[PDB]
PDB file of C-alpha atoms and ligand atoms in Angstrom:
ATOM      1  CA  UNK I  26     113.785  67.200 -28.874  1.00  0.00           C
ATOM      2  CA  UNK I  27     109.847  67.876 -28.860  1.00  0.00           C
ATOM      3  CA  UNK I  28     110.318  69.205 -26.218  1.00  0.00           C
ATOM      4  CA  UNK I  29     112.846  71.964 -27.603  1.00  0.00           C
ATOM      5  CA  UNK I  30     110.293  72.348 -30.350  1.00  0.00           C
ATOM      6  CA  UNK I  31     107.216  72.874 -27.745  1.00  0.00           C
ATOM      7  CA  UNK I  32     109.555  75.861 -26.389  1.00  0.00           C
ATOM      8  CA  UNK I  33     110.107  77.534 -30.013  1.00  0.00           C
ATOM      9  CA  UNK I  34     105.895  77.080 -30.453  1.00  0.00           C
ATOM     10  CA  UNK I  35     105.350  78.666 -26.882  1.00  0.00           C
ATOM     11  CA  UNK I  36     107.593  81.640 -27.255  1.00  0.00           C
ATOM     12  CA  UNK I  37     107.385  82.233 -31.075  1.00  0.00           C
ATOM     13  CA  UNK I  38     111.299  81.750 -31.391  1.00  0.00           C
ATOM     14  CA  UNK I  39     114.171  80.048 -33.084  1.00  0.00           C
ATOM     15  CA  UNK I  40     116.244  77.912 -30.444  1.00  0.00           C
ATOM     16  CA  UNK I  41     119.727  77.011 -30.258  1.00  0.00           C
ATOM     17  CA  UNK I  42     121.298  74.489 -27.800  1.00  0.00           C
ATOM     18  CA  UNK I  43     124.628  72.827 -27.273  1.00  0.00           C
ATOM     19  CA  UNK I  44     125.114  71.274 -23.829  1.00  0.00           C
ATOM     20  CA  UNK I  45     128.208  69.074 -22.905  1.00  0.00           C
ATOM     21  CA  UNK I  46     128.475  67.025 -19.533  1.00  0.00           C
ATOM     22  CA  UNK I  47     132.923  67.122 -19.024  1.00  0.00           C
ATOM     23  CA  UNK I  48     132.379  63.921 -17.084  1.00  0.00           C
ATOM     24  CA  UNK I  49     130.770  61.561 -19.378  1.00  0.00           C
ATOM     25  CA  UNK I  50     130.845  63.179 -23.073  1.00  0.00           C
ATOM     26  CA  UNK I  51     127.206  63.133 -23.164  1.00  0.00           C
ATOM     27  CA  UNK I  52     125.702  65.918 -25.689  1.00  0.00           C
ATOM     28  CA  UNK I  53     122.609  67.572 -26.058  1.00  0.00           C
ATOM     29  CA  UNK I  54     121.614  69.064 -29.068  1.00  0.00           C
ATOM     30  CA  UNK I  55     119.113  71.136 -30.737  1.00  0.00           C
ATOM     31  CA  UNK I  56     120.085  73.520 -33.741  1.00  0.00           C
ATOM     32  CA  UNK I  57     123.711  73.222 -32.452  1.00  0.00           C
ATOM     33  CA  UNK I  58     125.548  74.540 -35.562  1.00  0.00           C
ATOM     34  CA  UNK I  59     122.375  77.319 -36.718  1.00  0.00           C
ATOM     35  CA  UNK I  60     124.187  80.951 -36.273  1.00  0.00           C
ATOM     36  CA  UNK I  61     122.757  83.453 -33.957  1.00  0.00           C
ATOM     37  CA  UNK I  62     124.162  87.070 -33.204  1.00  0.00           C
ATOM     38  CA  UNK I  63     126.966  85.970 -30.290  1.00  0.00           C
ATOM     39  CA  UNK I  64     125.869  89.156 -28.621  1.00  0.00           C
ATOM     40  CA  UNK I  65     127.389  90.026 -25.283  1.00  0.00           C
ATOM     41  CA  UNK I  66     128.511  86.422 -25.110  1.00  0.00           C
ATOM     42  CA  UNK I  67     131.595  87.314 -26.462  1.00  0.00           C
ATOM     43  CA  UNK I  68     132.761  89.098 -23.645  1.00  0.00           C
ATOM     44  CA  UNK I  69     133.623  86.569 -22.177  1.00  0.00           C
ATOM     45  CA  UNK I  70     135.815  85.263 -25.034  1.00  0.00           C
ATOM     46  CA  UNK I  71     136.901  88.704 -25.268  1.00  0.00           C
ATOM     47  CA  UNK I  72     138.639  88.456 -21.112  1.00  0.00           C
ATOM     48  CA  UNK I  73     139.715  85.099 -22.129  1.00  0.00           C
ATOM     49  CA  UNK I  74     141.731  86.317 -25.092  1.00  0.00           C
ATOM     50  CA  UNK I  75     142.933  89.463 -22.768  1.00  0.00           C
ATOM     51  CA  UNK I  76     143.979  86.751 -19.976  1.00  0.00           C
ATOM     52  CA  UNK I  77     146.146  84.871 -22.497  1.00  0.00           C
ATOM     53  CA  UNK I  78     147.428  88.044 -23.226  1.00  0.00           C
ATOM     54  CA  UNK I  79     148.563  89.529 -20.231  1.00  0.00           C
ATOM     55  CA  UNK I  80     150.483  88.467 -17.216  1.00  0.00           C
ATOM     56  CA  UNK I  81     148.030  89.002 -13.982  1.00  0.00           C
ATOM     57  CA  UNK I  82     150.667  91.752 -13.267  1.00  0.00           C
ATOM     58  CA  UNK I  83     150.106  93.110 -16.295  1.00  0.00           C
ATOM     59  CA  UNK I  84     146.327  93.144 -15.888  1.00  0.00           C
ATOM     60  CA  UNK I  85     146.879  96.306 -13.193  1.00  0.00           C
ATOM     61  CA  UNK I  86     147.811  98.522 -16.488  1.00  0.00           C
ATOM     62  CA  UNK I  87     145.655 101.690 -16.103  1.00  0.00           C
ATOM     63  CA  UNK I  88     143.385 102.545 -18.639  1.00  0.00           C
ATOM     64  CA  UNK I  89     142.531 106.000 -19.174  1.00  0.00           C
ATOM     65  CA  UNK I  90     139.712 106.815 -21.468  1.00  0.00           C
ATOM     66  CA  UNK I  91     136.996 109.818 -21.986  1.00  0.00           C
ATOM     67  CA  UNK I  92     133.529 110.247 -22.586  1.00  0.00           C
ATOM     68  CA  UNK I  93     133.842 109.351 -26.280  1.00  0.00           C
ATOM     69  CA  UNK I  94     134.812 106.117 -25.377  1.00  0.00           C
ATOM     70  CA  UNK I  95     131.298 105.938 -23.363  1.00  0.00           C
ATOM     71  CA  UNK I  96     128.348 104.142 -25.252  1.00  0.00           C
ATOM     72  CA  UNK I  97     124.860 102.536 -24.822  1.00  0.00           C
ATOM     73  CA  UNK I  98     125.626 101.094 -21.617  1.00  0.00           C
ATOM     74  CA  UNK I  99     128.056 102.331 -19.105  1.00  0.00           C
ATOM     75  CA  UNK I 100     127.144 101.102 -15.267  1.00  0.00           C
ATOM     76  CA  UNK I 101     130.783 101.058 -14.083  1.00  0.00           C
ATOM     77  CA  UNK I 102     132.900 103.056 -16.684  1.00  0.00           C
ATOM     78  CA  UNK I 103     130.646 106.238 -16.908  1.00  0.00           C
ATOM     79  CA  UNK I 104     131.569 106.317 -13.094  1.00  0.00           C
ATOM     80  CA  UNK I 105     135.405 106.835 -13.474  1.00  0.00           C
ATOM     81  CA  UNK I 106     136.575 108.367 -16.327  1.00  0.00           C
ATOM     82  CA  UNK I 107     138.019 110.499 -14.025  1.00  0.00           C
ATOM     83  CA  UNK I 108     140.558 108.232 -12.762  1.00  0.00           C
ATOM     84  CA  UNK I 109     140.241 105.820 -15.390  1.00  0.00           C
ATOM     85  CA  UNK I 110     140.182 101.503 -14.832  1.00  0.00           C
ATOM     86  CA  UNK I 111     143.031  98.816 -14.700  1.00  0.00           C
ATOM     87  CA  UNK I 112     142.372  95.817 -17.243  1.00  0.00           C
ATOM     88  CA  UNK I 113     141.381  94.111 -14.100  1.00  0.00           C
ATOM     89  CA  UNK I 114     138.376  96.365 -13.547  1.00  0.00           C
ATOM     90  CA  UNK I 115     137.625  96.541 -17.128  1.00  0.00           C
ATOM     91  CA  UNK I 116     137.542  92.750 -16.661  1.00  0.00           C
ATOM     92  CA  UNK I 117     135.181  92.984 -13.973  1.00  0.00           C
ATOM     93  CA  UNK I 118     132.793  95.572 -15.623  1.00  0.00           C
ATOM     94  CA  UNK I 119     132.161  93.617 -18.659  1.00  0.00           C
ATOM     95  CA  UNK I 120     131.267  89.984 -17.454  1.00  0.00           C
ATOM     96  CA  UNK I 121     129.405  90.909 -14.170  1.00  0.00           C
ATOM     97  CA  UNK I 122     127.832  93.631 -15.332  1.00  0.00           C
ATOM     98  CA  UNK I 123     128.216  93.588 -19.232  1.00  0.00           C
ATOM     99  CA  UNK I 124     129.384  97.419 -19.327  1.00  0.00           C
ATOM    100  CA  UNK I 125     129.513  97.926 -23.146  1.00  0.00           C
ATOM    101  CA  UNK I 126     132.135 100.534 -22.611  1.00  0.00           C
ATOM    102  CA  UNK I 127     134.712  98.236 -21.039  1.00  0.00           C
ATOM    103  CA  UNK I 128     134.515  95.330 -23.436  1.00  0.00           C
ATOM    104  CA  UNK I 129     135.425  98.354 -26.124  1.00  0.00           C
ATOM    105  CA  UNK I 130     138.203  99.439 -24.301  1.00  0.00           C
ATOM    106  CA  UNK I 131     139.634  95.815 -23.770  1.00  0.00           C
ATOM    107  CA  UNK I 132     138.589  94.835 -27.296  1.00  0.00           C
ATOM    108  CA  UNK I 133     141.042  97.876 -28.298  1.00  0.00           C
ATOM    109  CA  UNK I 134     143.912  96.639 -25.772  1.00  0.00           C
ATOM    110  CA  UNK I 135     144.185  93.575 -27.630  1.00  0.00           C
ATOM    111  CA  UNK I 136     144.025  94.656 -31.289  1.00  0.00           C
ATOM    112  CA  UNK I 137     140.379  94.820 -32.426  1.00  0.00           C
ATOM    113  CA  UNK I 138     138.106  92.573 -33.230  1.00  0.00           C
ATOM    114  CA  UNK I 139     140.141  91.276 -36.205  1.00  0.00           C
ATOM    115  CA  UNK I 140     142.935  90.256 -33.610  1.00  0.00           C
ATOM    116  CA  UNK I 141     139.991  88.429 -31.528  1.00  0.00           C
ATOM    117  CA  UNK I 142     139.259  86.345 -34.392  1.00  0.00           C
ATOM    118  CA  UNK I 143     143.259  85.413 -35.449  1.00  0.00           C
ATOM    119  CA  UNK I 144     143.319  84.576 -31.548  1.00  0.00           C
ATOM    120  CA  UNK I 145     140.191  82.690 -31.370  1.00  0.00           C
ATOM    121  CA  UNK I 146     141.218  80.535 -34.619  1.00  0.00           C
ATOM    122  CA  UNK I 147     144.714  80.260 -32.623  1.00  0.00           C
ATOM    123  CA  UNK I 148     142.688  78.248 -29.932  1.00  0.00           C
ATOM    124  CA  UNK I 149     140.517  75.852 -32.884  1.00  0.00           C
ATOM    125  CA  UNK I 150     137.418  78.046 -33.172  1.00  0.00           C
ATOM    126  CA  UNK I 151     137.030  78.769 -36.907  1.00  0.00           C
ATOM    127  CA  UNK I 152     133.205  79.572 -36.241  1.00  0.00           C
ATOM    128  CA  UNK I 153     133.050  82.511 -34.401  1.00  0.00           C
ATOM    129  CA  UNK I 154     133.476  85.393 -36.375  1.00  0.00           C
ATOM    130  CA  UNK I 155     133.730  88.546 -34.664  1.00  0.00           C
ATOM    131  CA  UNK I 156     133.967  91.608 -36.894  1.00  0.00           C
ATOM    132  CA  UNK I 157     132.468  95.233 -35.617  1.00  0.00           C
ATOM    133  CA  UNK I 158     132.685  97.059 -32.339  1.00  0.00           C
ATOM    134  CA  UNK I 159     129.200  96.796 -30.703  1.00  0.00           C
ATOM    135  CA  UNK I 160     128.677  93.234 -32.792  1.00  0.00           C
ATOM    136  CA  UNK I 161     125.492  94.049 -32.464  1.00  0.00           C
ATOM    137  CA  UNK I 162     123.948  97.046 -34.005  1.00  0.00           C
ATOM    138  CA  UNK I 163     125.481  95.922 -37.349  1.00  0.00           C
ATOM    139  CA  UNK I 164     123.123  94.332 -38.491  1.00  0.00           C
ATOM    140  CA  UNK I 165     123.186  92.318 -41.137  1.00  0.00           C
ATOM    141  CA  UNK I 166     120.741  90.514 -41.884  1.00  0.00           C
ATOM    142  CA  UNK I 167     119.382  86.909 -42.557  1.00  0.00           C
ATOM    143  CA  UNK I 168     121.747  85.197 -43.580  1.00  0.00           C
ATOM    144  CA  UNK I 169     124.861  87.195 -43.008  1.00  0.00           C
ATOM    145  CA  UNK I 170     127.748  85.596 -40.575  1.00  0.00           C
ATOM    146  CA  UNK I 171     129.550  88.655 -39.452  1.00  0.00           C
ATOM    147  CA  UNK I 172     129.609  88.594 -35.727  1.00  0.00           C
ATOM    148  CA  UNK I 173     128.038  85.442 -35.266  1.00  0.00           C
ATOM    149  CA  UNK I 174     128.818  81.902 -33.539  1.00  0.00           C
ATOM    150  CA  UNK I 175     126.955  79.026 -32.907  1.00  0.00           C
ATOM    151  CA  UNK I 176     125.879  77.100 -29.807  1.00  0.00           C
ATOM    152  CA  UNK I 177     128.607  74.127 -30.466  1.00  0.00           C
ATOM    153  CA  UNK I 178     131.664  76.341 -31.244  1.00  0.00           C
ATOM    154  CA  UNK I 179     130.832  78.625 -28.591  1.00  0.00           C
ATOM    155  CA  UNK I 180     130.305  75.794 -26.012  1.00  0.00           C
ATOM    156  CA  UNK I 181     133.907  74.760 -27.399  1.00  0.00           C
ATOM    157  CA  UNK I 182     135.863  78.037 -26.740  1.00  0.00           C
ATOM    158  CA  UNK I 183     134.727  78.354 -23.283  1.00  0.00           C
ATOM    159  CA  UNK I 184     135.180  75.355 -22.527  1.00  0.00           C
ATOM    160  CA  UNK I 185     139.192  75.881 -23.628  1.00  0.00           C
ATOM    161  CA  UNK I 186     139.604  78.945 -22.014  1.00  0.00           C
ATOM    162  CA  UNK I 187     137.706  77.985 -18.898  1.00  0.00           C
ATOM    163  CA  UNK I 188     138.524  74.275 -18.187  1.00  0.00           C
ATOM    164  CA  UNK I 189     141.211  72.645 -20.361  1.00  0.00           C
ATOM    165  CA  UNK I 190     144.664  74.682 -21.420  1.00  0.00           C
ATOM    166  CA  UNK I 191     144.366  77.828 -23.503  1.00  0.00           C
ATOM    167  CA  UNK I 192     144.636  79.668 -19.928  1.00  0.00           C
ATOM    168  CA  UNK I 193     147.275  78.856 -16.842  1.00  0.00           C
ATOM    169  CA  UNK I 194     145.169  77.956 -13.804  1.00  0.00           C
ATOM    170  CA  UNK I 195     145.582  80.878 -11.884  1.00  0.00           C
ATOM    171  CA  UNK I 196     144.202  82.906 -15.439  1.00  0.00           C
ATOM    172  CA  UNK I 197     141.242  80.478 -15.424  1.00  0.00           C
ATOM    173  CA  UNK I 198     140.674  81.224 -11.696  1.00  0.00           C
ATOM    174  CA  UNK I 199     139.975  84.367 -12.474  1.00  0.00           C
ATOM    175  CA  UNK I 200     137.545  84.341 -15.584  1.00  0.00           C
ATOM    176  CA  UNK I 201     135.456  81.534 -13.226  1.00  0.00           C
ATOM    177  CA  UNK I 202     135.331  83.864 -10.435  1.00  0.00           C
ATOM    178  CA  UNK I 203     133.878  86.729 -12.960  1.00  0.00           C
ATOM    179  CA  UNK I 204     131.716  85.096 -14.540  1.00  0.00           C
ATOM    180  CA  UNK I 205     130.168  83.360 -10.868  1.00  0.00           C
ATOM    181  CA  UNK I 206     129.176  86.379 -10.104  1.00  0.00           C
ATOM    182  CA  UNK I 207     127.863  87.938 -13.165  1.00  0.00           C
ATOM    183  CA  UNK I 208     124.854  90.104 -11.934  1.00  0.00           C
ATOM    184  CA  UNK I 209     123.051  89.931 -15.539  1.00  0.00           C
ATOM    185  CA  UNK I 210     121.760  86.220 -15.621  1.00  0.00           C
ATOM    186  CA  UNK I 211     119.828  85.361 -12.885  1.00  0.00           C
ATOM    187  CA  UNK I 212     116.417  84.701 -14.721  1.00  0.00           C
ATOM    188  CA  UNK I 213     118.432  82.811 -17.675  1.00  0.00           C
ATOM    189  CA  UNK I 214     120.388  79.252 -17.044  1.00  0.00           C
ATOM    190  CA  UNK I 215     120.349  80.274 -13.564  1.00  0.00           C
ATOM    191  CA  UNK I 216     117.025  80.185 -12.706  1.00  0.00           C
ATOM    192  CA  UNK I 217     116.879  76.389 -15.135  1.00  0.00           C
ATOM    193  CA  UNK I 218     119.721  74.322 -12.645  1.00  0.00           C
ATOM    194  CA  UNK I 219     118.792  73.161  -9.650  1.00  0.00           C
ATOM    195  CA  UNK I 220     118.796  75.124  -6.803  1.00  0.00           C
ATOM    196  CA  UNK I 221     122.528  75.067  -4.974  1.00  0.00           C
ATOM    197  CA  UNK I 222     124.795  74.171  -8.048  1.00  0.00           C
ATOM    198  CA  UNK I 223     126.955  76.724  -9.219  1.00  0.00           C
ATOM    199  CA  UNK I 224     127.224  78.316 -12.666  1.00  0.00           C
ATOM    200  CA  UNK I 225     129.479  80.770 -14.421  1.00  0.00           C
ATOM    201  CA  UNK I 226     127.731  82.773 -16.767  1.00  0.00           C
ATOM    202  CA  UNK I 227     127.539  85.843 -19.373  1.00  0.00           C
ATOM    203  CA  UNK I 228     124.556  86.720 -21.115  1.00  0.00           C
ATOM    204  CA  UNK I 229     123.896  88.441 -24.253  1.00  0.00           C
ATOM    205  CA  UNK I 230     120.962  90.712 -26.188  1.00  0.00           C
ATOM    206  CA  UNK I 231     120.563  91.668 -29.641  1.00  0.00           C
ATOM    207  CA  UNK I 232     117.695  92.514 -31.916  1.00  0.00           C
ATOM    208  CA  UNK I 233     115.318  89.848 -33.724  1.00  0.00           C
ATOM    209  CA  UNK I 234     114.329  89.182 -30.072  1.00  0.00           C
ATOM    210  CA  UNK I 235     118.336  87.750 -29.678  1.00  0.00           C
ATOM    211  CA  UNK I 236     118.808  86.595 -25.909  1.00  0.00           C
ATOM    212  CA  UNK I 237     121.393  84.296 -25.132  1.00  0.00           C
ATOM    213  CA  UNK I 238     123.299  82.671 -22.274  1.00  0.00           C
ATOM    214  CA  UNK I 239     126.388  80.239 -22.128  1.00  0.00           C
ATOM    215  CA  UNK I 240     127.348  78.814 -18.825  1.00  0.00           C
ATOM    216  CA  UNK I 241     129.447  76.402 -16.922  1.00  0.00           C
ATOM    217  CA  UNK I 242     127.479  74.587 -14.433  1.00  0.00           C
ATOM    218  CA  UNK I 243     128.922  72.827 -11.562  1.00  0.00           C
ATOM    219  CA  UNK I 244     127.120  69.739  -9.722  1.00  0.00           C
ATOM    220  CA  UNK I 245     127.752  69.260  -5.937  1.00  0.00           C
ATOM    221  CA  UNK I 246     129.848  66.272  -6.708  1.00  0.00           C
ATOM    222  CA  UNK I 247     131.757  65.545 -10.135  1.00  0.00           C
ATOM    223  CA  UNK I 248     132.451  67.071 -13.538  1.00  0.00           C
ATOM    224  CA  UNK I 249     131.205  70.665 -14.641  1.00  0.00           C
ATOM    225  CA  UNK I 250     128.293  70.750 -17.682  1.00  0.00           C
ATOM    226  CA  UNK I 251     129.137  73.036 -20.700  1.00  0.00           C
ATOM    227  CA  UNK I 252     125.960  74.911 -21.664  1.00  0.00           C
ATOM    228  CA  UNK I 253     124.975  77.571 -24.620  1.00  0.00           C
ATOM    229  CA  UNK I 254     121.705  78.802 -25.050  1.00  0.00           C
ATOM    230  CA  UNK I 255     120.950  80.835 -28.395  1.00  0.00           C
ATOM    231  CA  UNK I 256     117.500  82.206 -29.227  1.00  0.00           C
ATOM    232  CA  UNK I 257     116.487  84.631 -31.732  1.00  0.00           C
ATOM    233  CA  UNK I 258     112.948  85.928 -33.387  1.00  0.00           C
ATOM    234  CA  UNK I 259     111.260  86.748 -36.825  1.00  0.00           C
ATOM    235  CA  UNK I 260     111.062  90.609 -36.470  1.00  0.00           C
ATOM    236  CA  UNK I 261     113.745  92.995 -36.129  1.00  0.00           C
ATOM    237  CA  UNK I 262     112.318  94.877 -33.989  1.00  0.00           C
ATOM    238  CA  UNK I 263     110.477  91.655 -31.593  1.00  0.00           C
ATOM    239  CA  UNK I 264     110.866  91.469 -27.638  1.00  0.00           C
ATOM    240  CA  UNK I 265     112.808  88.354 -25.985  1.00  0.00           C
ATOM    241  CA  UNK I 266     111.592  86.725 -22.966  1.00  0.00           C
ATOM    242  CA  UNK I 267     114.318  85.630 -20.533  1.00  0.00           C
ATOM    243  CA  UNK I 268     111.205  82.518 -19.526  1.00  0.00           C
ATOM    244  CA  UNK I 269     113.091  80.902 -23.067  1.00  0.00           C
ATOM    245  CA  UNK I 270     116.135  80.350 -21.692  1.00  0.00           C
ATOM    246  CA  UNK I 271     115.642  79.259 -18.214  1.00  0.00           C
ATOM    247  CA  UNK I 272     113.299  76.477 -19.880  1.00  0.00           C
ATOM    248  CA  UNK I 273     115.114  75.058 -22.263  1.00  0.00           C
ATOM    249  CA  UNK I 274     117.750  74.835 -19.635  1.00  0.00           C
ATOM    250  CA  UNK I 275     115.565  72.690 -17.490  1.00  0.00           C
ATOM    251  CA  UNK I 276     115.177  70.450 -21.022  1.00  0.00           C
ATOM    252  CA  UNK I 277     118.668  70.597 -21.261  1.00  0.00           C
ATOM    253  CA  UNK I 278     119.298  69.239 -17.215  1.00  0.00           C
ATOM    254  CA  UNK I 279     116.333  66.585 -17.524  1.00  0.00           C
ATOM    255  CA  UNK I 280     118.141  65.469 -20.741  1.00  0.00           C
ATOM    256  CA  UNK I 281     121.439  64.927 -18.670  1.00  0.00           C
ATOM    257  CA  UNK I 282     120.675  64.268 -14.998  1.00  0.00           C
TER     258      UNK I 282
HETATM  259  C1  BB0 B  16     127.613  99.050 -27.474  1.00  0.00           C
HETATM  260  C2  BB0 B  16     126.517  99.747 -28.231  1.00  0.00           C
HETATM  261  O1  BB0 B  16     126.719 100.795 -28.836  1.00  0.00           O
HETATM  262  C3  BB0 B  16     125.136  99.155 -28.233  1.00  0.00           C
HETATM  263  C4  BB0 B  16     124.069  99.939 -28.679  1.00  0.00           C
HETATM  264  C5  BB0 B  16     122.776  99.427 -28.691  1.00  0.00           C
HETATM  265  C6  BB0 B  16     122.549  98.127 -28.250  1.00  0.00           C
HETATM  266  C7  BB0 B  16     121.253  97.618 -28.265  1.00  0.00           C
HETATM  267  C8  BB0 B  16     120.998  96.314 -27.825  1.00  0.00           C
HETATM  268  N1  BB0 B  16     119.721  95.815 -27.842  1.00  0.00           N
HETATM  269  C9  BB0 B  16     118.605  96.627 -28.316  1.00  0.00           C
HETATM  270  C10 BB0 B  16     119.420  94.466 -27.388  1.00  0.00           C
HETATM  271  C11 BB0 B  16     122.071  95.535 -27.374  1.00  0.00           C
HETATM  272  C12 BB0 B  16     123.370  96.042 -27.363  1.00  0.00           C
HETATM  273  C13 BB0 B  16     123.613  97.338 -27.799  1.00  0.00           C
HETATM  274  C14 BB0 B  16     124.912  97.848 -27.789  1.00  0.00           C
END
């Protein structure tokens, strides 16, 4: 679009869009297969892979870690080392609140981020390529492609772990219900659907002015939309403004509606 293009002239940004409506096939598309920094987005992944793994049973394994194990960003795990987390809670803390310390712990329960590629490749994403623990800080530069995805294959992996069959239903129940109430995204795609619809989201940040946001987006009525929103900046060391995302979103929903 122009009207993509307008955005990346208003905010001084590189944009990155790949929207799907389930119900009709229609696309949207603007830089859909340019790599950005996944960021936190793969958290989400990241549960998806761990849901796969683990019976729901299973998920009530405690975890028991120490203050090592604590990093940048700790809302929920810096308050229980004490009696440790279940996968469940680790879960929890990681999409709705993006605690860095539980997607660690979980990336660890299910091999590293080596085994989170072999399983994402398992499911058909040959894209995404996760490679460090805290993606993130690596870093890397232009034009590296270690822990990077793009707005298409990233669409396409949530969309299989969410909606069609690399999870049982009861599994995708729960990774929904997560990422519903994520607490970190409501100035992103939230704050571009209308008002009422609901949307499952996890955000992400990295450096170069990274700030992204993928989403499922339910209408009243009818089939969900697919939506990931990439945006990075020139400078390593350049601000994001969340105003990006929730606009090209509204692009994105004029574009489909
Ligand atoms: C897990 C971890 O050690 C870590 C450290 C610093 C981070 C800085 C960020 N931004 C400056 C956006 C984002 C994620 C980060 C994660």
């Amino acid at each position: 679009k122009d009207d993509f293009a307008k955005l990346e002239e208003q905010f001084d940004a590189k944009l990155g869009i790949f929207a799907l409506d389930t119900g009709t096939n229609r696309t949207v598309a603007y830089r859909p297969d340019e790599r950005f920094a996944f960021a936190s987005t793969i958290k989400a992944l990241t549960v998806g892979v761990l849901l796969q793994q683990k019976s729901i049973e299973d998920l009530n394994q405690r975890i028991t870690y120490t203050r090592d194990d604590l990093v940048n960003y700790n809302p929920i795990t810096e308050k229980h080392v004490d009696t440790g987390m279940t996968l469940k809670e680790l879960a929890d803390a990681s999409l709705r609140y993006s605690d860095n310390a539980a997607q660690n712990l979980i990336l660890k329960q299910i091999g590293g981020p080596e085994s989170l590629k072999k399983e994402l490749r398992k499911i058909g994403d040959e894209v995404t390529n996760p490679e460090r623990f805290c993606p993130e800080l690596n870093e890397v530069n232009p034009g590296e492609t270690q822990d990077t995805s793009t707005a298409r294959a990233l669409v396409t992996s949530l969309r299989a772990f969410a909606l069609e069959d690399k999870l049982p239903s009861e599994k995708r129940e729960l990774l929904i219900d997560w990422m519903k109430r994520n607490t970190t995204g409501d100035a992103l795609i939230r704050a571009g659907v209308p008002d009422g619809w609901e949307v499952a989201d996890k955000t992400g940040a990295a450096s170069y002015g990274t700030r992204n946001d993928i989403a499922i987006i339910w209408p009243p009525k009818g089939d969900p939309v697919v939506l990931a929103v990439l945006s990075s900046r020139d400078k390593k060391d350049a601000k994001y403004d969340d105003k990006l995302i929730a606009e090209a979103t509204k692009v994105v929903m004029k574009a489909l509606n």
